[PDB]
Paper text:
The São Paulo MBL (SPM‐1) is widely distributed in South America, Europe and North America, in the Gram‐negative pathogen Pseudomonas aeruginosa. Like other B1 MBLs (NDM, VIM and IMP),10 SPM‐1 has a binuclear zinc center, but has loop characteristics of the B2 MBLs, suggesting it is a B1/B2 hybrid, which, consequently, may be challenging to inhibit. SPM‐1, like other B1 MBLs, has a di‐zinc ion active site with one zinc ion bound at a (normally tetrahedral) tri‐histidine site (Zn1) and one in a trigonal bipyramidal site (Zn2) comprised of conserved Asp, Cys, and His residues. SPM‐1 is distinguished from other B1 MBLs in possessing a “wall” of hydrophobic residues involving Phe57 and Tyr58 on its L3 loop, Phe79 on the loop connecting α5 and α1, and Phe151 and Tyr152 on the kinked α3 helix in the “closed” form, as well as Tyr228 on the opposite side of the active site cleft.
SPM‐1 crystallized in its di‐zinc “closed” form,10a in which the α3 region folds over the active site, and in a previously unreported space group (P4222). The resolution extended to 1.7 Å for uncomplexed crystals and 2.38 Å for inhibitor soaked crystals.
Author numbering: 34 to 56, 58 to 63, 63Q, 64 to 209, 216 to 226, 230 to 253, 256 to 267, 296 to 316
Write the structure that this text describes.
Amino acid sequence: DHVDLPYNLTATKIDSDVFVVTDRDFYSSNVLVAKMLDGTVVIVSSPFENLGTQTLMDWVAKTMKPKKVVAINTHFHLDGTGGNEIYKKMGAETWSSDLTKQLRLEENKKDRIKAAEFYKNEDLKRRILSSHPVPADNVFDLKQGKVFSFSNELVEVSFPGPAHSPDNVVVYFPKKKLLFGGCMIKPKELGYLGDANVKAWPDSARRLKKFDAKIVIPGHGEWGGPEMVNKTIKVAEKAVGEMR
Ligand SMILES: [Cl-]
Ligand SMILES: [Cl-]
Ligand SMILES: [Zn+2]
Ligand SMILES: [Zn+2]
Ligand SMILES: [Zn+2]
Ligand SMILES: [Zn+2]
């Protein structure tokens, strides 16, 4: 089933050398952890804050003994950039699009106390206020994307268009046939609409059909197969229809 971690994280194995770690205190946010054939560990997205992320990195160190860690932010929300403080502290190489870095820096200008009020309880508010999110150390041009090659094993980061957020990117692992679609994968309901482009979302999701994926991992909730994309398109087009 799963391994129980501190701060209400759970880790589930979905393939050889591939795990999903879920932050169950903060909106059941999913984090992909994949060990490459050459020993590099790639982490996609993040827990919301420092206690969760330290917990994640302790588990990565203990169970995978990485040669090197590369962390890829999926978008500027805290499930995305909330891990950067601890990723950096633990020596990981953090990456995001230039737009994600810009949006995180702008978000940091907002009054923190007001932002923390939308959280469930006092314990979570205190944890959020005890972390101070930072952008990634390394950036790529959003529309160009980024391809890593770890001893000829590729990891492809690409922008399919605005959907859940203006900056959402997906991460594809061709050898493992694994697509981390993040928070633009919404097979039942679209969720938080604040930064969304609902009109663009159907065509942005249509761009995910090209991937030869056996597993599609969403930003929240259970992962599935390529049908996760089909479902998302229908959910988004339903919302667009309701809109006029
Ligand atoms: Cl404000
Ligand atoms: Cl269909
Ligand atoms: Zn359990
Ligand atoms: Zn988000
Ligand atoms: Zn700090
Ligand atoms: Zn999310």
